[PDB]
Protein backbone atom coordinates (compact mmCIF):
# COMPACT_ATOMS: atom_id res chain seq x y z
CA UNK A 1 0.00 0.00 0.00
CA UNK A 2 2.25 2.82 -1.22
CA UNK A 3 1.13 5.81 0.85
CA UNK A 4 -1.02 8.70 -0.45
CA UNK A 5 1.85 11.14 -0.91
CA UNK A 6 -0.07 12.47 -3.92
CA UNK A 7 -2.87 13.28 -1.49
CA UNK A 8 -0.58 15.94 0.02
CA UNK A 9 1.91 17.09 -2.71
CA UNK A 10 -0.84 17.13 -5.39
CA UNK A 11 -3.60 18.59 -3.15
CA UNK A 12 -5.66 21.14 -5.17
CA UNK A 13 -5.88 23.48 -2.16
CA UNK A 14 -3.09 24.34 0.27
CA UNK A 15 -3.47 25.96 3.67
CA UNK A 16 -2.18 29.27 4.92
CA UNK A 17 1.05 28.89 6.87
CA UNK A 18 -0.49 30.20 10.11
CA UNK A 19 -3.12 27.42 9.95
CA UNK A 20 -0.84 24.75 8.49
CA UNK A 21 -2.38 21.30 8.49
CA UNK A 22 -0.65 18.01 9.24
CA UNK A 23 -1.42 14.64 7.64
CA UNK A 24 -0.41 11.61 9.70
CA UNK A 25 0.83 8.84 7.41
CA UNK A 26 0.74 5.28 8.73
CA UNK A 27 0.34 1.67 7.63
CA UNK A 28 2.03 1.87 4.24
CA UNK A 29 5.30 1.57 2.35
CA UNK A 30 7.01 4.83 1.35
CA UNK A 31 9.04 5.15 -1.86
CA UNK A 32 10.95 8.31 -1.01
CA UNK A 33 13.35 8.26 -3.95
CA UNK A 34 10.35 8.04 -6.29
CA UNK A 35 9.10 11.16 -4.50
CA UNK A 36 12.48 12.82 -5.06
CA UNK A 37 12.31 12.00 -8.77
CA UNK A 38 8.75 13.29 -9.29
CA UNK A 39 10.74 16.53 -9.63
CA UNK A 40 9.53 20.11 -10.12
CA UNK A 41 11.15 20.70 -6.70
CA UNK A 42 13.21 23.81 -6.01
CA UNK A 43 14.04 22.79 -2.44
CA UNK A 44 14.53 19.24 -1.14
CA UNK A 45 16.86 19.06 1.88
CA UNK A 46 16.85 16.27 4.45
CA UNK A 47 18.26 16.77 7.94
CA UNK A 48 19.96 13.78 9.54
CA UNK A 49 19.11 11.48 6.60
CA UNK A 50 19.31 10.89 2.82
CA UNK A 51 16.23 10.04 0.70
CA UNK A 52 17.96 7.02 -0.80
CA UNK A 53 18.93 5.65 2.61
CA UNK A 54 15.53 6.32 4.18
CA UNK A 55 13.43 4.32 1.70
CA UNK A 56 15.38 1.40 3.13
CA UNK A 57 14.35 2.45 6.66
CA UNK A 58 11.10 2.40 8.63
CA UNK A 59 9.52 4.62 11.26
CA UNK A 60 6.64 4.39 13.71
CA UNK A 61 4.69 7.14 11.92
CA UNK A 62 5.33 9.86 9.35
CA UNK A 63 3.76 13.32 9.25
CA UNK A 64 3.32 15.60 6.22
CA UNK A 65 2.91 19.31 6.98
CA UNK A 66 1.83 21.46 4.05
CA UNK A 67 1.21 25.18 3.55
CA UNK A 68 2.01 28.17 1.32
CA UNK A 69 4.60 30.92 1.73
CA UNK A 70 6.80 32.78 -0.75
CA UNK A 71 10.25 32.21 -2.14
CA UNK A 72 12.30 34.36 0.22
CA UNK A 73 10.81 32.62 3.28
CA UNK A 74 11.55 28.96 2.43
CA UNK A 75 14.92 29.46 4.12
CA UNK A 76 12.97 29.95 7.36
CA UNK A 77 11.60 26.39 7.02
CA UNK A 78 14.89 25.05 8.35
CA UNK A 79 16.02 24.21 11.89
CA UNK A 80 17.26 27.10 13.99
CA UNK A 81 15.94 29.91 11.80
CA UNK A 82 14.14 33.10 12.81
CA UNK A 83 11.77 35.55 11.13
CA UNK A 84 8.05 36.09 10.87
CA UNK A 85 7.41 32.57 9.56
CA UNK A 86 9.63 30.59 11.95
CA UNK A 87 8.75 32.84 14.90
CA UNK A 88 5.02 33.36 14.34
CA UNK A 89 3.67 30.78 11.86
CA UNK A 90 5.55 27.44 11.54
CA UNK A 91 8.51 26.43 13.72
CA UNK A 92 10.70 23.32 13.33
CA UNK A 93 12.75 21.84 16.18
CA UNK A 94 16.52 22.11 16.26
CA UNK A 95 16.77 18.29 16.37
CA UNK A 96 14.61 17.95 13.25
CA UNK A 97 14.63 14.50 11.61
CA UNK A 98 12.95 14.94 8.25
CA UNK A 99 12.91 16.57 4.84
CA UNK A 100 11.60 19.95 3.70
CA UNK A 101 10.10 19.95 0.19
CA UNK A 102 9.15 23.15 -1.62
CA UNK A 103 8.42 24.19 -5.19
CA UNK A 104 7.33 27.35 -6.99
CA UNK A 105 3.56 27.47 -7.52
CA UNK A 106 3.32 30.93 -9.09
CA UNK A 107 1.34 29.35 -11.94
CA UNK A 108 -1.36 28.28 -9.46
CA UNK A 109 -1.43 30.45 -6.32
CA UNK A 110 -1.02 33.81 -8.10
CA UNK A 111 -3.55 35.67 -10.21
CA UNK A 112 -3.67 38.94 -12.13
CA UNK A 113 -4.68 41.55 -9.58
CA UNK A 114 -3.37 39.49 -6.66
CA UNK A 115 -4.54 36.45 -4.69
CA UNK A 116 -5.17 37.60 -1.11
CA UNK A 117 -6.47 34.28 0.24
CA UNK A 118 -3.12 33.06 1.57
CA UNK A 119 -2.36 34.60 4.96
CA UNK A 120 0.44 34.60 7.52
CA UNK A 121 0.60 35.77 11.11
CA UNK A 122 2.14 39.22 11.30
CA UNK A 123 2.39 39.73 15.08
CA UNK A 124 2.74 37.41 18.07
CA UNK A 125 3.82 38.23 21.61
CA UNK A 126 5.92 35.06 21.92
CA UNK A 127 7.64 32.76 19.45
CA UNK A 128 6.07 29.43 18.60
CA UNK A 129 7.20 26.12 20.02
CA UNK A 130 8.40 23.55 17.49
CA UNK A 131 5.33 22.23 15.65
CA UNK A 132 3.02 24.56 17.57
CA UNK A 133 0.02 25.89 15.66
CA UNK A 134 -1.82 29.12 16.57
CA UNK A 135 -4.85 30.14 14.51
CA UNK A 136 -5.94 33.08 16.67
CA UNK A 137 -7.59 35.97 14.83
CA UNK A 138 -7.94 38.15 17.92
CA UNK A 139 -6.61 41.65 17.50
CA UNK A 140 -3.00 42.04 18.58
CA UNK A 141 -2.23 44.45 21.43
CA UNK A 142 1.10 45.94 20.35
CA UNK A 143 1.12 48.55 23.12
CA UNK A 144 0.01 49.00 26.71
CA UNK A 145 -3.57 50.08 26.10
CA UNK A 146 -6.28 47.44 25.64
CA UNK A 147 -7.95 46.90 22.28
CA UNK A 148 -11.41 45.97 23.64
CA UNK A 149 -12.01 44.27 20.30
CA UNK A 150 -11.90 47.46 18.23
CA UNK A 151 -9.15 47.86 15.66
CA UNK A 152 -7.27 51.06 16.41
CA UNK A 153 -3.88 52.49 17.16
CA UNK A 154 -1.46 49.82 18.45
CA UNK A 155 -4.32 47.31 17.90
CA UNK A 156 -3.88 45.33 14.69
CA UNK A 157 -5.63 42.46 13.01
CA UNK A 158 -2.91 39.81 13.47
CA UNK A 159 -2.96 38.22 9.99
CA UNK A 160 -1.61 39.67 6.74
CA UNK A 161 -2.53 38.36 3.30
CA UNK A 162 0.15 37.70 0.73
CA UNK A 163 -0.13 39.83 -2.38
CA UNK A 164 0.50 37.02 -4.86
CA UNK A 165 0.62 38.34 -8.42
CA UNK A 166 2.16 36.53 -11.42
CA UNK A 167 4.57 39.45 -11.98
CA UNK A 168 6.13 39.54 -8.51
CA UNK A 169 9.82 38.82 -8.07
CA UNK A 170 11.04 35.28 -7.45
CA UNK A 171 11.17 36.03 -3.71
CA UNK A 172 7.58 37.34 -3.57
CA UNK A 173 5.98 34.49 -5.54
CA UNK A 174 3.99 31.64 -3.95
CA UNK A 175 5.76 28.41 -3.02
CA UNK A 176 3.99 25.27 -1.86
CA UNK A 177 5.83 23.49 0.94
CA UNK A 178 5.70 19.99 2.41
CA UNK A 179 7.60 18.98 5.54
CA UNK A 180 7.96 15.26 6.21
CA UNK A 181 8.78 14.27 9.79
CA UNK A 182 9.77 10.73 10.78
CA UNK A 183 8.61 9.37 14.14
CA UNK A 184 10.42 6.35 15.59
CA UNK A 185 8.80 5.26 18.84
CA UNK A 186 9.57 2.18 20.88
CA UNK A 187 6.63 0.71 18.97
CA UNK A 188 5.96 -1.26 15.76
CA UNK A 189 7.12 0.55 12.63
CA UNK A 190 4.26 0.60 10.11
CA UNK A 191 5.72 2.99 7.49
CA UNK A 192 8.55 1.10 5.80
CA UNK A 193 10.60 1.72 2.69
CA UNK A 194 10.61 -0.76 -0.20
CA UNK A 195 14.24 -1.67 0.50
CA UNK A 196 13.83 -2.25 4.23
CA UNK A 197 14.16 -5.68 5.82
CA UNK A 198 10.37 -5.73 6.23
CA UNK A 199 9.71 -5.96 2.47
Amino acid at each position, epitope marked *: NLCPFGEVFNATRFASVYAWN*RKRISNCVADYSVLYNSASFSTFKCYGVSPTKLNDLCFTNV*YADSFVIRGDEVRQIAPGQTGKIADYNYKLPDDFTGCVIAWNSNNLDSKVGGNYNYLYRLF*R*K*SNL*K*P*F*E*R*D*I*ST*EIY*QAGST*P*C*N*GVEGFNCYFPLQSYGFQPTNGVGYQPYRVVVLSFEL*L*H*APATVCGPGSHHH
Partner: antibody
Amino acid sequence: EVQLVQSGAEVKKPGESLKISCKGSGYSFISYWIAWVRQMPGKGLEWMGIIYPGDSDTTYSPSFQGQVTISADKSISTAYLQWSSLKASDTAIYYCARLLYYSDSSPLDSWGQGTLVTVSS
Amino acid sequence: DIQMTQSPSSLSASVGDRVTITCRASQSISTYLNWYQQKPGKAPNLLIYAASSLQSGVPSRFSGSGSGTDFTLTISSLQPEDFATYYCQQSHSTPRTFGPGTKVDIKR
Protein backbone atom coordinates in the same frame (compact mmCIF):
# COMPACT_ATOMS: atom_id res chain seq x y z
CA GLU B 1 -13.49 13.75 16.82
CA VAL B 2 -11.11 15.69 19.04
CA GLN B 3 -11.34 14.01 22.44
CA LEU B 4 -9.57 13.87 25.79
CA VAL B 5 -10.20 10.85 28.02
CA GLN B 6 -9.14 10.85 31.66
CA SER B 7 -8.49 7.92 33.96
CA GLY B 8 -11.08 6.57 36.40
CA ALA B 9 -12.09 7.62 39.89
CA GLU B 10 -9.50 7.35 42.67
CA VAL B 11 -9.85 6.66 46.40
CA LYS B 12 -6.68 7.25 48.40
CA LYS B 13 -5.53 7.94 51.94
CA PRO B 14 -3.66 11.05 53.13
CA GLY B 15 0.08 10.86 52.50
CA GLU B 16 -0.12 8.56 49.48
CA SER B 17 1.01 9.32 45.95
CA LEU B 18 -1.36 9.55 43.00
CA LYS B 19 -0.96 9.97 39.25
CA ILE B 20 -3.89 10.51 36.87
CA SER B 21 -3.82 10.63 33.10
CA CYS B 22 -5.44 12.44 30.17
CA LYS B 23 -5.16 10.79 26.76
CA GLY B 24 -5.86 12.85 23.65
CA SER B 25 -6.82 11.75 20.16
CA GLY B 26 -8.17 13.27 16.98
CA TYR B 27 -5.50 15.95 16.59
CA SER B 28 -1.76 16.66 16.81
CA PHE B 29 -1.24 16.19 20.54
CA ILE B 30 2.19 17.87 20.58
CA SER B 31 0.86 21.03 18.92
CA TYR B 32 -1.59 22.22 21.59
CA TRP B 33 -1.21 23.16 25.24
CA ILE B 34 -3.11 21.23 27.93
CA ALA B 35 -4.63 22.83 31.03
CA TRP B 36 -5.64 21.19 34.30
CA VAL B 37 -8.66 22.54 36.19
CA ARG B 38 -9.83 21.66 39.70
CA GLN B 39 -13.46 21.65 40.85
CA MET B 40 -13.90 20.95 44.54
CA PRO B 41 -17.23 19.46 45.71
CA GLY B 42 -20.08 21.87 45.04
CA LYS B 43 -17.65 24.62 44.02
CA GLY B 44 -16.57 26.32 40.81
CA LEU B 45 -13.53 26.00 38.57
CA GLU B 46 -9.87 26.72 39.37
CA TRP B 47 -7.08 27.02 36.80
CA MET B 48 -4.15 24.93 38.06
CA GLY B 49 -1.63 25.15 35.25
CA ILE B 50 -0.72 24.44 31.66
CA ILE B 51 1.77 22.22 29.81
CA TYR B 52 2.98 21.99 26.21
CA PRO B 53 3.25 18.26 25.36
CA GLY B 54 5.84 18.90 22.66
CA ASP B 55 8.54 19.71 25.23
CA SER B 56 6.79 19.57 28.65
CA ASP B 57 7.28 23.30 29.26
CA THR B 58 4.98 24.08 32.19
CA THR B 59 3.62 27.21 33.84
CA TYR B 60 1.74 26.71 37.09
CA SER B 61 -0.71 28.89 38.87
CA PRO B 62 1.07 30.28 41.98
CA SER B 63 -1.61 28.71 44.16
CA PHE B 64 -0.64 25.26 42.85
CA GLN B 65 3.11 25.73 42.33
CA GLY B 66 4.98 23.21 44.44
CA GLN B 67 1.73 21.48 45.42
CA VAL B 68 1.32 19.28 42.32
CA THR B 69 3.26 18.24 39.23
CA ILE B 70 2.03 18.50 35.64
CA SER B 71 3.89 16.29 33.17
CA ALA B 72 3.36 14.68 29.78
CA ASP B 73 4.33 11.70 27.67
CA LYS B 74 4.00 12.59 24.00
CA SER B 75 4.88 9.05 22.88
CA ILE B 76 1.37 8.00 24.03
CA SER B 77 -0.36 11.39 23.66
CA THR B 78 -0.97 11.70 27.40
CA ALA B 79 -0.76 14.42 30.03
CA TYR B 80 -0.52 13.76 33.76
CA LEU B 81 -1.35 15.34 37.09
CA GLN B 82 0.69 13.99 39.99
CA TRP B 83 0.84 14.31 43.79
CA SER B 84 3.56 12.95 46.07
CA SER B 85 1.59 13.33 49.32
CA LEU B 86 -2.20 13.64 49.17
CA LYS B 87 -4.29 15.67 51.60
CA ALA B 88 -7.99 15.48 52.41
CA SER B 89 -8.33 18.98 50.94
CA ASP B 90 -7.35 17.53 47.54
CA THR B 91 -10.75 15.81 47.28
CA ALA B 92 -12.19 17.21 44.06
CA ILE B 93 -12.81 16.60 40.38
CA TYR B 94 -9.89 17.34 38.06
CA TYR B 95 -10.37 18.13 34.37
CA CYS B 96 -7.85 18.36 31.58
CA ALA B 97 -8.59 20.71 28.70
CA ARG B 98 -7.01 21.66 25.40
CA LEU B 99 -6.25 25.31 24.64
CA LEU B 100 -7.43 26.22 21.16
CA TYR B 101 -4.26 28.33 21.10
CA TYR B 102 -1.72 29.78 23.49
CA SER B 103 -2.19 33.50 22.95
CA ASP B 104 -4.98 36.02 23.58
CA SER B 105 -8.15 34.48 25.12
CA SER B 106 -6.51 31.02 25.20
CA PRO B 107 -9.91 29.29 25.28
CA LEU B 108 -10.39 25.74 26.56
CA ASP B 109 -12.26 24.29 23.60
CA SER B 110 -12.17 20.56 24.49
CA TRP B 111 -12.38 19.03 27.98
CA GLY B 112 -11.88 15.56 29.34
CA GLN B 113 -14.74 14.05 31.32
CA GLY B 114 -13.02 14.57 34.68
CA THR B 115 -11.36 12.38 37.31
CA LEU B 116 -12.89 12.24 40.78
CA VAL B 117 -10.22 12.00 43.48
CA THR B 118 -11.36 11.15 47.02
CA VAL B 119 -8.84 11.41 49.85
CA SER B 120 -10.00 9.79 53.07
CA SER B 121 -8.36 7.97 55.96
CA ASP C 1 -5.37 37.48 40.88
CA ILE C 2 -8.10 39.10 38.77
CA GLN C 3 -11.42 38.54 40.55
CA MET C 4 -14.36 37.54 38.34
CA THR C 5 -17.96 38.23 39.37
CA GLN C 6 -21.27 37.12 37.86
CA SER C 7 -24.79 38.41 38.37
CA PRO C 8 -27.33 37.20 39.13
CA SER C 9 -25.93 34.31 41.16
CA SER C 10 -29.09 32.35 40.26
CA LEU C 11 -31.78 32.86 37.63
CA SER C 12 -35.26 31.45 37.17
CA ALA C 13 -36.30 31.35 33.51
CA SER C 14 -38.86 29.71 31.24
CA VAL C 15 -38.43 28.08 27.86
CA GLY C 16 -38.55 30.77 25.20
CA ASP C 17 -37.30 33.57 27.46
CA ARG C 18 -34.50 35.91 26.50
CA VAL C 19 -31.90 35.47 29.25
CA THR C 20 -28.90 37.70 29.93
CA ILE C 21 -26.11 36.91 32.39
CA THR C 22 -23.41 39.42 33.32
CA CYS C 23 -19.74 38.99 34.22
CA ARG C 24 -17.59 41.67 35.85
CA ALA C 25 -13.79 41.71 36.19
CA SER C 26 -11.97 43.54 38.97
CA GLN C 27 -9.83 45.23 36.27
CA SER C 28 -9.90 45.65 32.51
CA ILE C 29 -9.31 42.47 30.50
CA SER C 30 -9.97 43.87 27.01
CA THR C 31 -12.05 41.08 25.36
CA TYR C 32 -9.98 38.17 26.73
CA LEU C 33 -13.09 36.59 28.18
CA ASN C 34 -14.62 33.15 27.63
CA TRP C 35 -18.01 31.69 28.57
CA TYR C 36 -18.62 28.05 29.50
CA GLN C 37 -21.67 25.88 30.20
CA GLN C 38 -21.71 23.09 32.78
CA LYS C 39 -24.46 20.60 33.72
CA PRO C 40 -24.37 18.28 36.74
CA GLY C 41 -22.09 15.29 36.36
CA LYS C 42 -20.63 16.77 33.16
CA ALA C 43 -17.50 18.61 32.17
CA PRO C 44 -17.77 22.25 31.02
CA ASN C 45 -18.30 23.12 27.35
CA LEU C 46 -16.97 26.23 25.61
CA LEU C 47 -19.70 28.58 24.38
CA ILE C 48 -18.01 31.94 23.68
CA TYR C 49 -14.37 33.02 23.45
CA ALA C 50 -12.75 36.43 23.05
CA ALA C 51 -15.97 37.98 24.41
CA SER C 52 -18.10 37.48 21.28
CA SER C 53 -16.69 34.67 19.12
CA LEU C 54 -19.15 31.76 18.98
CA GLN C 55 -17.55 28.33 19.29
CA SER C 56 -18.32 26.03 16.38
CA GLY C 57 -21.17 23.62 17.04
CA VAL C 58 -22.73 26.01 19.59
CA PRO C 59 -26.32 27.08 18.75
CA SER C 60 -26.66 30.56 17.29
CA ARG C 61 -29.01 31.62 20.11
CA PHE C 62 -25.92 32.13 22.31
CA SER C 63 -24.01 35.39 21.95
CA GLY C 64 -21.48 37.38 23.94
CA SER C 65 -20.69 41.07 24.15
CA GLY C 66 -18.81 43.51 26.35
CA SER C 67 -15.24 44.62 26.97
CA GLY C 68 -13.01 46.01 29.67
CA THR C 69 -14.78 45.14 32.91
CA ASP C 70 -18.38 44.47 31.76
CA PHE C 71 -19.51 41.40 29.81
CA THR C 72 -22.83 39.75 29.03
CA LEU C 73 -23.92 36.34 27.83
CA THR C 74 -27.28 36.36 26.03
CA ILE C 75 -29.48 33.44 24.99
CA SER C 76 -32.09 34.62 22.49
CA SER C 77 -34.70 31.92 23.26
CA LEU C 78 -34.08 29.60 26.21
CA GLN C 79 -34.41 25.93 25.30
CA PRO C 80 -34.82 22.88 27.56
CA GLU C 81 -31.15 21.94 27.00
CA ASP C 82 -30.04 25.38 28.25
CA PHE C 83 -30.89 24.95 31.93
CA ALA C 84 -27.43 24.69 33.48
CA THR C 85 -24.67 26.73 35.14
CA TYR C 86 -22.65 29.28 33.17
CA TYR C 87 -19.11 30.40 34.02
CA CYS C 88 -17.04 33.27 32.68
CA GLN C 89 -13.26 33.02 32.55
CA GLN C 90 -10.71 35.79 32.10
CA SER C 91 -7.58 35.19 30.05
CA HIS C 92 -5.95 38.64 30.39
CA SER C 93 -3.66 37.67 33.27
CA THR C 94 -2.03 34.65 34.80
CA PRO C 95 -3.36 32.90 36.76
CA ARG C 96 -6.47 32.42 34.68
CA THR C 97 -9.56 32.80 36.87
CA PHE C 98 -13.22 31.85 36.57
CA GLY C 99 -16.37 33.53 37.79
CA PRO C 100 -18.38 31.71 40.47
CA GLY C 101 -21.03 30.72 37.93
CA THR C 102 -24.73 31.45 37.63
CA LYS C 103 -27.24 28.61 37.63
CA VAL C 104 -30.38 29.00 35.39
CA ASP C 105 -33.19 26.75 36.88
CA ILE C 106 -36.74 26.26 35.37
CA LYS C 107 -39.27 28.89 36.60
CA ARG C 108 -42.21 27.74 38.68
